Amino acid sequence: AETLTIATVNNGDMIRMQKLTDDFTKKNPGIDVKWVTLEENVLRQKVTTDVATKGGQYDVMTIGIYEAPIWGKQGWLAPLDKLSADKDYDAADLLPPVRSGLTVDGKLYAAPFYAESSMVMYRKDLFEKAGLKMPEAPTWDFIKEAADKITDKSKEVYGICLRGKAGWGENIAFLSAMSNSFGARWFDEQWKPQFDQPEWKKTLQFYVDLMKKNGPPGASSNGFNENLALFQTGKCGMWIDATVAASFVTNPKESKVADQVGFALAPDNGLGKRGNWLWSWNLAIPAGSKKVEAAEKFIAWATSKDYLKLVAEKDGWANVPPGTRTSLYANADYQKAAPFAKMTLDSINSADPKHPTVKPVPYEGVQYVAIPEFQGIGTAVGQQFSAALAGQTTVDQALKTAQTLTEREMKKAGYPK
Ligand SMILES: OC[C@@H](O)[C@@H](O)[C@H](O)[C@H](O)CO
């Protein structure tokens, strides 16, 4: 009777959902589902276009915690009021930092499919061999020291892998969060960019030096999913990235290293911010959809306690989508299955998008800046920083250009207001 076209990202938990929709259609027999599966940079571009232009291409959209409140405030998204009121759905069980990030003027504009922070994943075996112990709360100087000791570029072992692929939510997510730990900020309180200041220089130079010495070849091509593969296939001593990866790297069905993974907090520099981030991937409906009832039903199915149970039954408790529900972290079976759960939740809770930086800022967001202009600005700055990583431009030149383009775009948009 109704068919939903759903735009989503090519991440593992979504690929897994695509295999489980018979459960949805069995429970909702008039409703079928088809997919448009895209890399995250491209998803963002296509969904933004669709939603802004009322393109009608996607009935359900996979969107981030960045987009949800912006688009929600603008009137571009249908409110998920039926979900918010539904007893079995139990929206109160959604983690508060996550639910609150998706809510505007008392209405929920997207439902979280999974959420995450960031942390260090490392190879226990390679640490033991190098004579190293990972502190629970490492510094960046320790990470640098460790990476230098583990690299064995002859045996295709890189001491560290980090995001290098250009994109507002790819390399820029990682670098922005890392910069906070170095005492940087994107903007001062007058919305002047800060790429010409010492803390961004320190961050970017630290990153480029680290990656040139100890990272994989062509890292400027590696996003989240390429790094996940490098880590899983045993090529990476340490990877500092999304907590969602923890289940994937410890699944022996897809990870050679599954029994050798350790976890520690995002690294810092003793400045008072660690820079662990807060992200969620969410499902949303365009305002003015003529398929709201069916779309609501799908979103409720995918983001319910029952969906977690469905995945647990099929693939094991460790492999459910993380970070969305108090009841998941309270579940003894999940805790037994997922040794990374406590640190994941602790990190989701400690992430501080309200106060991301050492110096006060006019924006919110750890790894992004919560303004509508960020997609375009972050994309352009991501291209500069990827070029610096690749040795195509100097670190200093990349920062000069980032400063100039950001000034240009912000003045064009009218800041400060
Ligand atoms: O969930 C893993 C990634 O899709 C996610 O970390 C995104 O890169 C996001 O942009 C991080 O803020």
UniProtKB/TrEMBL annotation:
Q: Where in the cell is it found?
A: Periplasm
User: What are the cysteine partners in each disulfide bond?
Assistant: C161-C236
UniProt GO cellular component terms: periplasmic space
Domain of life from the UniProt record: Bacteria
One Pfam family matching this protein: SBP_bac_1
Does Amino-acid biosynthesis appear among the keywords? no
Q: Which UniProt keywords apply?
A: Periplasm, Signal
Family to which this protein belongs = Belongs to the bacterial solute-binding protein 1 family.
Q: What is this protein called?
A: ABC transporter substrate binding protein (Sorbitol)
Q: What species is this protein from?
A: Allorhizobium ampelinum (strain ATCC BAA-846 / DSM 112012 / S4) (Agrobacterium vitis (strain S4))
